[PDB]
Amino acid sequence: GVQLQESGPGLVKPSQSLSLTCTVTGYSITSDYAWNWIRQFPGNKLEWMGYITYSGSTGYNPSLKSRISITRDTSKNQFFLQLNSVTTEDTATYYCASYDDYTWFTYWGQGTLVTVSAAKTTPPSVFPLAPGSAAQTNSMVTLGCLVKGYFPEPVTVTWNSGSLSSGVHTFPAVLQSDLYTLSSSVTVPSSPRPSETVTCNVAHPASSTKVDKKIVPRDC
Amino acid sequence: KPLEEVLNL
Amino acid sequence: DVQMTQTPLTLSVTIGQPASISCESSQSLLYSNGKTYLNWLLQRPGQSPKRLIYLVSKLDSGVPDRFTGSGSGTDFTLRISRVEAEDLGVYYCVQGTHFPRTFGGGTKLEIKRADAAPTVSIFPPSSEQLTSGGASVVCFLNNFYPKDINVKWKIDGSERQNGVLNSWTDQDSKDSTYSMSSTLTLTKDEYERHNSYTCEATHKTSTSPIVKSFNRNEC
Numbered sequence A: 001g002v003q004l005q006e007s008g009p010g011l012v013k014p015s016q017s018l019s020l021t022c023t024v025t026g027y028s029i030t031s032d033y034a035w036n037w038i039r040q041f042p043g044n045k046l047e048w049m050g051y052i053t054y055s056g057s058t059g060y061n062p063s064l065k066s067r068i069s070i071t072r073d074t075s076k077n078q079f080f081l082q083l084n085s086v087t088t089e090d091t092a093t094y095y096c097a098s099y100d101d102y103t104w105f106t107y108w109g110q111g112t113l114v115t116v117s118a119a120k121t122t123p124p125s126v127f128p129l130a131p132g133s134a135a136q137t138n139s140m141v142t143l144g145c146l147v148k149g150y151f152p153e154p155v156t157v158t159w160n161s162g163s164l165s166s167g168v169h170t171f172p173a174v175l176q177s178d179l180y181t182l183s184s185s186v187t188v189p190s191s192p193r194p195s196e197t198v199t200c201n202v203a204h205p206a207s208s209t210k211v212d213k214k215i216v217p218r219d220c
Numbered sequence B: 001k002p003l004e005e006v007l008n009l
Numbered sequence C: 001d002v003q004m005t006q007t008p009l010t011l012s013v014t015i016g017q018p019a020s021i022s023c024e025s026s027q028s029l030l031y032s033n034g035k036t037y038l039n040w041l042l043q044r045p046g047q048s049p050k051r052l053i054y055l056v057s058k059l060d061s062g063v064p065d066r067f068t069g070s071g072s073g074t075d076f077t078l079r080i081s082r083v084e085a086e087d088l089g090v091y092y093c094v095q096g097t098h099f100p101r102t103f104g105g106g107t108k109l110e111i112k113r114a115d116a117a118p119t120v121s122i123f124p125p126s127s128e129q130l131t132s133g134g135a136s137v138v139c140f141l142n143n144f145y146p147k148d149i150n151v152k153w154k155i156d157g158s159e160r161q162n163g164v165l166n167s168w169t170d171q172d173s174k175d176s177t178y179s180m181s182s183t184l185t186l187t188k189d190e191y192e193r194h195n196s197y198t199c200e201a202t203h204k205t206s207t208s209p210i211v212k213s214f215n216r217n218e219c
Helices: C127-131
Strands: A004-007 A018-024 A034-040 A046-053 A058-060 A068-073 A078-083 A092-099 A106-108 A112-116 A125-129 A140-150 A156-159 A168-170 A174-176 A179-189 A199-204 A209-214 C004-007 C010-014 C019-025 C038-043 C050-054 C067-072 C075-080 C089-095 C107-112 C119-123 C134-144 C150-155 C164-168 C178-187 C196-202 C210-215
Touching: A004 A092, A018 A034, A018 A092, A018 A112, A046 A068, A046 A078, A058 A068, A078 A092, A106 C050, A125 A199, A125 A209, A125 C127, A140 A156, A140 A199, A140 C119, A140 C134, A156 A179, A174 C164, A179 C134, A179 C164, A179 C178, C004 C089, C010 C019, C019 C089, C019 C107, C038 C067, C050 C067, C075 C089, C119 C196, C119 C210, C127 C134, C134 C150, C134 C196, C150 C164, C150 C178
Parallel strands: C010 C107
Antiparallel strands: A004 A018, A018 A078, A034 A046, A034 A092, A046 A058, A068 A078, A092 A106, A092 A112, A125 A140, A140 A179, A156 A199, A168 A179, A174 A179, A199 A209, C004 C019, C019 C075, C038 C050, C038 C089, C067 C075, C089 C107, C119 C134, C134 C178, C150 C196, C164 C178, C196 C210
């Protein structure tokens, strides 16, 4: 869909070479413009890596020239990034973008998270957070879902598959040791829960894990 | 060298 | 390597009020061909950067009159006539006349609004986790403002603890409030020794802290 798309591993062991793909939809990557690769480090810090022009010409950021390489497949209308000898410092969000700096044409992709670590991929454990007593005859009621010790990022969390969007807060994951813990809360009027079903759906792309957890009461 | 030139040379 | 400096680092504006951001480059961005390649980007929470202005002052399509860019040589200014809720996010400044192209350190813009008290919620471990031999007490502090807030955990009296994971959310674009999650992780044996679990939040919206706890004697 959309216009630009990044695809690639989400985990890469240090010392090996990273390889990302940007599939371009809606415009020919041979017609015009520069197709770059930008990455965002944990801190909002942006770094332009390199580009490949519609004519095949490349430009690389000197801080990377030695281990960077950019290619393309004009038939499948997509370009690639090959970064060799990665380290945990190469961990960051990778974006592919197109622009020429002087005309209206400017498009960024959605970006992919690429973490470099020797750690092993591990599914997330999902636990239900039901109110302990609280109030039944009350305006609202907040429920919760805890996603304990997974790796690597990211994890996706939705309630009832998307039905509930308002009153939903999914908190930034916190890493401890070599695992990630993240939670998500949702506030629903006392009318629905515990009557109607409220399910917590979390998915872990990296491990092809997907789980639905129903928020069941207990009260007292 | 700027893209405006790179892309038109 | 050309540095781009932006100021302020953070900017707190009230809706409707005007705002302006500054960008300084280590070298003149004027190109021999007369143009100066400087662009402005906005990165809204959970999204990728979006270009708003190019060639110092040209607005990209879909961008509102409210945004104006100006300057020359080394100093540039992004200005918003009237700030809107949807304008929250981080603003980047980027140059493209010198190789390699460089970005600014960004400027975070937060919508200022009335102070708000948080809604506290505590959760004892779930049997499901307990069997796994562990136990986590979770405390949610939702929709408060300002972001400044302190949480303390107390097991069996003021005996505070340390081994808790805290996480703040970006400012919601919906109601301009923040939310925080605080998780206390204890082993099951440790958890079954003590009796009272207290979540204490201090906020400037009050002198006495908001307290939420439970004793191990329920379901």
